[PDB]
Ligand binder design. Sequence first.
Ligand code: HEM
Ligand SMILES: O=C(CCCCn1ccnc1)N[C@@H](Cc1ccccc1)C(=O)O
Ligand SMILES: CCCc1ccccc1
Length: 454
Amino acid sequence: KEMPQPKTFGELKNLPLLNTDKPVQALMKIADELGEIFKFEAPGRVTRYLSSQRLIKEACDESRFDKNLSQALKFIRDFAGDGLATSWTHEKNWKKAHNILLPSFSQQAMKGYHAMMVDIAVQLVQKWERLNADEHIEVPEDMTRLTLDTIGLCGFNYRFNSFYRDQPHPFITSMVRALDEAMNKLQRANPDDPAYDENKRQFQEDIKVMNDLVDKIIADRKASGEQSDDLLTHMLNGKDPETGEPLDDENIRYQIITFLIAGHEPTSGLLSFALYFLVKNPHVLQKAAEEAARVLVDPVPSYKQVKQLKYVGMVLNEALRLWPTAPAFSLYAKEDTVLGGEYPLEKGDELMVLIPQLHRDKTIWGDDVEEFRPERFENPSAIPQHAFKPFGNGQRACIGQQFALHEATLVLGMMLKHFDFEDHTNYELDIKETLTLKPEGFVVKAKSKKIPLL
Ligand code: HEM
Ligand SMILES: O=C(CCCCn1ccnc1)N[C@@H](Cc1ccccc1)C(=O)O
Ligand SMILES: CCCc1ccccc1
């Protein structure tokens, strides 16, 4: 089979199609038109976008395909280095850091993060309890405040104090600007053109702001003494069982940058989309709120109670199905192979997995794919293999998945226990694309049920 390809622009090939504010949504529309696979070419680059479970289930075979750094990840590697998310599987520091940090995400470790997650969640609840009559909530803004504070505290015992601020923390301003610059480089035909000198100077400044915070985090800890048993503790003291080695100092700094970014951005999108879908689907909101009231019987949730918020967990997975907030990942062929019995690939050929489109495969989910129905997730064994991939694949899947879902279930459960919510503007979904996806401008009103936190 010859695969289709979207419209071209002479020698720029397909690259101008991604010169848009919303490239993932542009790629979803191409997939809608062209189907389960299309060729995408740019000057000096070829990739193939996959959208069907039929093909992606083959692409997830780790004996045939390994993680590729997309151009986005390659440009982010200029400040995330060989941290876990921007390392190749074959670099020594990938497996070393993977082995050292996996126990920081055990369910036992989650039991230890729980109290600090509650600390920040209570700050969010108190903020909303303290709003005056007919004031409203800026939803992604507050969810980002929460997820940033949670990864700083839980992981590094650093307080960003986001709920004390209107303007984002300087780290965020620089992080956002550095991520946007990295992604802008994709469209630059002549990146050494002097027109980009200011962009380059600004990029170095933003990387320095980020690295200054990492130095502060490391110096604060080395003063305090090893007595926090958190992520930084393992980054500073853990030894890889295979090599016997600890992480070196340069790699630790890259991990701190990696986790501060990865540990907050897509989780804030997930919580924002989950609240969006609940207020748009009030029967679902009512069922989730009934579960919260029944389970969360104490002034703050326990670790076990969060594990018992089954339906809330289903709500989160169904929000990840429609808007997976880390919406793509890239693979390369380890050897010559044939995809789907129809598309021969050579060793080194690249693939992109377009996760939001995979999650709309009607052969898997039925024709009602656009509807919000958490009950699709009642049973993992009823979901075909590789049909649902919001956390990636295989040994390169998200190391933070359980942290993200514990945090999001805790927070959404407390939100549903403590407030009734109103979609007072009849909000029209507008999805902003950065490193992640978020519903821009999403606002609600939250009426307190007046249930105390002490
Ligand atoms: C709802 C929230 C999240 C989503 C949807 C998400 C999604 C993903 C995806 C799709 C990947 C694979 C990327 C690729 O193959 O290129 C990944 C990897 C990773 N994520 Fe997440 N993530 C989330 C939360 C987190 C959190 C909370 C952390 C840290 C606490 C984290 C840290 C990482 C890291 C370090 C990797 C690289 C893992 C490796 O390759 O060894 N993520 N994430
Ligand atoms: O593939 C990634 C990188 C996604 C990173 C996902 N992520 C987030 C957190 N962890 C992982 N972008 C997509 C979409 C895109 C295209 C052009 C410009 C910008 C974006 C692509 O290049 O096709
Ligand atoms: C896949 C984790 C998100 C991330 C974090 C830092 C740098 C690149 C990607």
